[PDB]
Amino acid sequence: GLMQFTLPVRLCKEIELFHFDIGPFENMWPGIFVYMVHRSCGTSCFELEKLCRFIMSVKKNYRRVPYHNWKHAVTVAHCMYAILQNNHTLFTDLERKGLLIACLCHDLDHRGFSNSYLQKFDHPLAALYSTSTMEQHHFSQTVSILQLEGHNIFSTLSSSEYEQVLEIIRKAIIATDLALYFGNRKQLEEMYQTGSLNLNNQSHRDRVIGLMMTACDLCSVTKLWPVTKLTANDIYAEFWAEGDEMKKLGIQPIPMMDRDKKDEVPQGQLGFYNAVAIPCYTTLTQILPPTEPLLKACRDNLSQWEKVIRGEE
Numbered sequence: 001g002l003m004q005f006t007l008p009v010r011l012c013k014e015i016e017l018f019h020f021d022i023g024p025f026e027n028m029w030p031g032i033f034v035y036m037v038h039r040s041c042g043t044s045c046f047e048l049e050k051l052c053r054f055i056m057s058v059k060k061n062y063r064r065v066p067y068h069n070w071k072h073a074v075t076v077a078h079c080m081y082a083i084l085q086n087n088h089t090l091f092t093d094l095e096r097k098g099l100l101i102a103c104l105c106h107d108l109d110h111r112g113f114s115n116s117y118l119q120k121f122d123h124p125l126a127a128l129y130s131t132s133t134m135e136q137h138h139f140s141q142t143v144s145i146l147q148l149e150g151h152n153i154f155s156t157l158s159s160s161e162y163e164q165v166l167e168i169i170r171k172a173i174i175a176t177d178l179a180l181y182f183g184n185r186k187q188l189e190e191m192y193q194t195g196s197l198n199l200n201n202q203s204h205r206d207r208v209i210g211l212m213m214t215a216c217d218l219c220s221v222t223k224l225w226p227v228t229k230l231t232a233n234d235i236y237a238e239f240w241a242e243g244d245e246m247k248k249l250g251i252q253p254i255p256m257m258d259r260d261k262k263d264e265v266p267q268g269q270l271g272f273y274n275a276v277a278i279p280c281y282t283t284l285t286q287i288l289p290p291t292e293p294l295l296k297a298c299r300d301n302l303s304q305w306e307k308v309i310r311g312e313e
């Protein structure tokens with residue numbers, strides 16, 4: 001109760017900023033997460049014994065893949081922390097509880113392959129979950145870990161608060177399926193423009209929480225150029241492995257996944273920032289003005305990829 005987590009001064013200051021990188025020391029990431037839960041939620045939200053045990057089980061169930069790994073989980077949770085801390089009064093006690101945990105759990109047991117590769121491989125998960133294959137799996141894994149003895153961090157909630165938080169987490173994790181993002185942002189665009197957006201409407205909050213989840217999930221494009229550039233290598237390491245596996249199934253992969261087409265990456269990053277990232281953080285800033293720094297950083301990095309094409313780097 002009277003035990004705080006404290007960070008070194010540089011982290012204590014830099015963790016509050018959207019562009020914070022969690023660093024290369026794996027053994028500090030759990031404490032970083034707890035630090036963020038205590039400041040975002042309270043010293044009281046979770047039994048520390050239970051939280052710590054949950055955190056290490058979740059870690060254990062992320063795999064040693066180049067991008068969709070434990071560092072990604074904590075990175076995405078930190079971006080949610082920054083959004084929540086810059087939008088204090090907009091979010092309920094349960095939502096701050098649910099969303100940090102949703103972010104930490106959102107890619108549990110990711111194998112480094114897209115839902116498309118699972119479908120074409122005919123993976124058993126593709127027969128169990130026809131759409132949002134991995135995302136339904138990640139939520140399923142979150143519930144399994146919560147039901148490990150001594151792991152139920154939500155035990156102190158009423159029955160109804162419990163059903164609400166697991167519902168917040170389920171919707172939150174499903175929303176990380178980028179195939180659902182396009183329609184979600186367009187609906188939020190019309191609502192904001194026509195003025196029908198209403199955060200007291202639960203179906204509306206759901207959509208807004210989903211956009212936050214896309215924003216946190218894509219947040220590697222909102223870091224300083226050197227972080228963003230070096231994370232790009234990790235995402236492409238998976239994409240190329242997935243392309244290799246498509247060739248093994250006798251299917252020419254899209255250029256994004258073809259390691260024989262590295263030359264097309266700068267242009268592919270332009271398409272990605274223009275088609276996906278810039279619209280995401282634009283709509284998010286319109287709805288949640290204090291999240292503007294993510295849009296600004298995303299723009300700085302689009303400009304960095306333009307310079308790569310032009311030959312200036």
Ligand SMILES: CN(C)CCn1nc(-c2ccccn2)cc1NC(=O)c1nc(C2CC2)ccc1Nc1cncnc1
Pocket residue numbers: 178218220221228229231232235255256257264265266267268269271272276
């Ligand atoms: C959203 N995509 C699935 C389709 C669009 N697209 N097209 C190309 C492309 C097209 C043609 C040629 C080369 N590339 C590449 C992308 N996507 C990403 O780059 C990307 N995707 C994701 C989503 C989880 C999957 C996350 C991060 C990404 N980037 C990144 C950059 N910096 C740091 N961290 C991450």
Ligand SMILES: [Mg+2]
Pocket residue numbers: 106107134176177
């Ligand atoms: Mg995912």
Ligand SMILES: [Zn+2]
Pocket residue numbers: 072076106107176217
């Ligand atoms: Zn993710």
